Amino acid sequence: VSPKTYKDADFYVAPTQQDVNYDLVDDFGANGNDTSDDSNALQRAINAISRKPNGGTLLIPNGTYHFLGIQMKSNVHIRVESDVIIKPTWNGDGKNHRLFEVGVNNIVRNFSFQGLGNGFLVDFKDSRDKNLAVFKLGDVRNYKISNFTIDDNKTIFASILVDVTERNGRLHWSRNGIIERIKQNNALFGYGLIQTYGADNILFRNLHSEGGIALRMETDNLLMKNYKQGGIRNIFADNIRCSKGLAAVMFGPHFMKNGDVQVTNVSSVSCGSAVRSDSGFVELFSPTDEVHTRQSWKQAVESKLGRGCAQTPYAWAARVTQKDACLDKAKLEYGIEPGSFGTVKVFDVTARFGYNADLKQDQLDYFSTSNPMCKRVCLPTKEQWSKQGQIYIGPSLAAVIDTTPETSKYDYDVKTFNVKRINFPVNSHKTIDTNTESSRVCNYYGMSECSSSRWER
Numbered sequence: 001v002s003p004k005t006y007k008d009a010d011f012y013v014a015p016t017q018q019d020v021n022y023d024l025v026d027d028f029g030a031n032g033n034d035t036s037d038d039s040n041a042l043q044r045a046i047n048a049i050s051r052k053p054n055g056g057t058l059l060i061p062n063g064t065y066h067f068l069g070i071q072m073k074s075n076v077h078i079r080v081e082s083d084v085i086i087k088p089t090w091n092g093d094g095k096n097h098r099l100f101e102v103g104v105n106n107i108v109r110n111f112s113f114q115g116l117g118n119g120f121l122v123d124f125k126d127s128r129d130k131n132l133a134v135f136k137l138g139d140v141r142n143y144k145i146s147n148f149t150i151d152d153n154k155t156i157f158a159s160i161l162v163d164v165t166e167r168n169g170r171l172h173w174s175r176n177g178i179i180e181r182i183k184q185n186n187a188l189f190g191y192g193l194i195q196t197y198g199a200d201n202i203l204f205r206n207l208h209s210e211g212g213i214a215l216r217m218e219t220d221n222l223l224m225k226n227y228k229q230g231g232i233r234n235i236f237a238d239n240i241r242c243s244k245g246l247a248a249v250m251f252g253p254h255f256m257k258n259g260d261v262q263v264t265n266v267s268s269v270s271c272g273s274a275v276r277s278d279s280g281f282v283e284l285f286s287p288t289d290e291v292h293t294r295q296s297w298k299q300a301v302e303s304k305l306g307r308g309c310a311q312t313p314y315a316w317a318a319r320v321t322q323k324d325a326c327l328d329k330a331k332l333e334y335g336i337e338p339g340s341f342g343t344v345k346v347f348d349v350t351a352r353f354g355y356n357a358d359l360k361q362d363q364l365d366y367f368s369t370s371n372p373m374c375k376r377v378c379l380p381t382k383e384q385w386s387k388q389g390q391i392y393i394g395p396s397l398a399a400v401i402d403t404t405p406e407t408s409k410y411d412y413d414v415k416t417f418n419v420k421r422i423n424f425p426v427n428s429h430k431t432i433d434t435n436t437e438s439s440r441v442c443n444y445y446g447m448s449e450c451s452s453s454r455w456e457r
């Protein structure tokens with residue numbers, strides 16, 4: 001088999017005529033030489049441009065700017081000079097914040113945001129806000145986002161959210177677009193560069209994340225569970241990389257039925273694996289309105305599905321036991337089923353060994369073959385991450401990890417071609433699947449603690 005080819009125009013079509021060309025500083029008065037907010041100047045620039053029949057271009061010149069909660073509009077095309085630094089404006093209302101929103105509160109068509117030359121910088125290192133995302137997308141079609149570096153500080157949320165939004169009684173999401181040429185430094189393990197929820201015909205290219213996951217196709221937004229609309233279909237990706245993280249590319253459908261995906265040229269250095277695929281599953285969440293405990297939510301679930309039908313709940317989410325019998329009961333009561341992907345193919349995978357990968361607890365038993373004494377693995381301190389057990393740092397485990405339920409009726413497949421490993425120790429794993437043997441060789445909660453230097457990267 002060989003991969004299918006494509007051209008940029010299959011996804012995005014640039015404007016062939018425009019009405020205006022404005023400068024953020026010269027025409028709208030922003031100041032790139034101070035530490036003050038520039039959001040009003042950018043929002044007026046965007047609105048003035050969208051009011052012209054054929055839209056236009058806006059240049060953000062060299063300097064340092066502060067933005068938050070910007071609403072993008074139709075027919076607006078933003079270009080950013082190579083020495084620009086963009087930082088988030090402080091907002092202490094404790095809510096979830098984004099620098100830019102595209103189609104979340106309205107309809108957007110024909111839009112782009114691109115860095116010139118070798119790209120610019122989005123810097124979160126001086127921010128006190130932990131709940132930050134760079135872009136949140138909704139009802140937008142025919143768009144392009146490209147060329148910059150993100151200096152993260154282990155914030156919550158993935159940097160680019162390819163999400164859904166409600167309007168007129170149903171959900172809407174993005175279609176026809178390109179997201180490319182972005183590097184992220186110091187990401188928190190549970191997040192990373194991209195997270196996809198709802199999407200049709202999108203191309204992801206030249207993306208790299210240090211920590212977490214670069215292209216995380218984990219479709220679990222609760223709105224999609226209620227309306228039963230969303231998911232991703234007809235997705236293409238090329239040159240996706242990971243360093244000191246979980247994986248470069250990951251598939252995790254949760255409860256959603258998704259479509260087809262094609263990926264070429266995946267690489268990693270000191271990551272758990274280059275490619276990762278999780279089984280679909282049904283998880284029941286406890287109401288915030290009601291007070292519960294670990295064992296209290298588990299009991300509440302088994303009292304409806306049956307005994308042995310609920311896995312131990314975690315910070316509360318209870319995952320239904322992987323047994324056709326229980327799964328058939330959960331559908332009748334909650335009307336939910338395990339999700340999946342349609343056709344998925346990944347070509348040319350290269351994994352380079354290292355001692356500083358992000359690792360999950362349920363993966364540590366795979367060191368039994370090559371690292372029987374669990375050397376070089378550490379547990380982050382409570383100060384570093386308060387929920388001990390959710391993250392470990394240690395040697396890379398394999399080139400590919402696949403835990404889809406092969407012998408089950410709810411299985412889905414992710415096929416890999418031309419997989420290679422570099423500098424791995426004797427007896428390590430190439431592909432880990434549900435039949436791979438393992439044994440406990442690590443001290444889960446009593447092992448050595450990670451030094452500050454090792455966690456901070």
Ligand SMILES: O=S(=O)(O)O[C@@H]1[C@H](O[C@H]2O[C@@H]3CO[C@@H]([C@H]3O[C@@H]3O[C@H](CO)[C@H](OS(=O)(=O)O)[C@H](O[C@H]4O[C@@H]5CO[C@@H]([C@H]5O)[C@H]4OS(=O)(=O)O)[C@H]3O)[C@H]2OS(=O)(=O)O)[C@@H](O)[C@H](O)O[C@@H]1CO
Nearest residue numbers: 189190218246312313314315319360361362387388389390
């Ligand atoms: O109270 S304790 O002392 O902590 O009790 C201990 C055990 O609790 C722990 O159990 C595991 C290890 O650390 C915490 C919990 O981790 C979470 O386990 C999930 C199991 O399904 C899942 O692991 S996974 O399956 O490998 O993915 C969680 O990760 C996922 O979470 C979301 C779903 O997919 C991803 C997320 O979107 C994935 O994470 S990732 O994207 O980074 O890959 C994992 O975090 C801990 O419980 S806690 O609620 O987190 O505090 C307990 O089970 C045991 O019985 O006792 C010990 C102490 O004796």
Ligand SMILES: O=S(=O)(O)O[C@@H]1[C@H](O[C@H]2O[C@@H]3CO[C@@H]([C@H]3O)[C@H]2OS(=O)(=O)O)[C@@H](O)[C@H](O)O[C@@H]1CO
Nearest residue numbers: 093094095096097098131133136161163221222223
């Ligand atoms: O998409 S987000 O709103 O950014 O994240 C949500 C969820 O946060 C929201 O939850 C309710 C509805 O609007 C706000 C809150 O009242 C919003 O958070 S707020 O910005 O602090 O007000 C977040 O808690 C969860 O983790 O993710 C979902 C994903 O949509």
Ligand SMILES: [Ca+2]
Nearest residue numbers: 031036037038
């Ligand atoms: Ca300013």
Ligand SMILES: [Ca+2]
Nearest residue numbers: 060061062081
């Ligand atoms: Ca200039």
Ligand SMILES: [Ca+2]
Nearest residue numbers: 082118119120
């Ligand atoms: Ca530059």
Ligand SMILES: [Ca+2]
Nearest residue numbers: 404411412413
């Ligand atoms: Ca499978």
Ligand SMILES: [Ca+2]
Nearest residue numbers: 406411412413
């Ligand atoms: Ca199969």
Ligand SMILES: [Cl-]
Nearest residue numbers: 157158191195
């Ligand atoms: Cl996220």
Ligand code: NA
Nearest residue numbers: 149150151185
């Ligand atoms: Na930097």
Ligand code: NA
Nearest residue numbers: 132155156157
């Ligand atoms: Na973030």
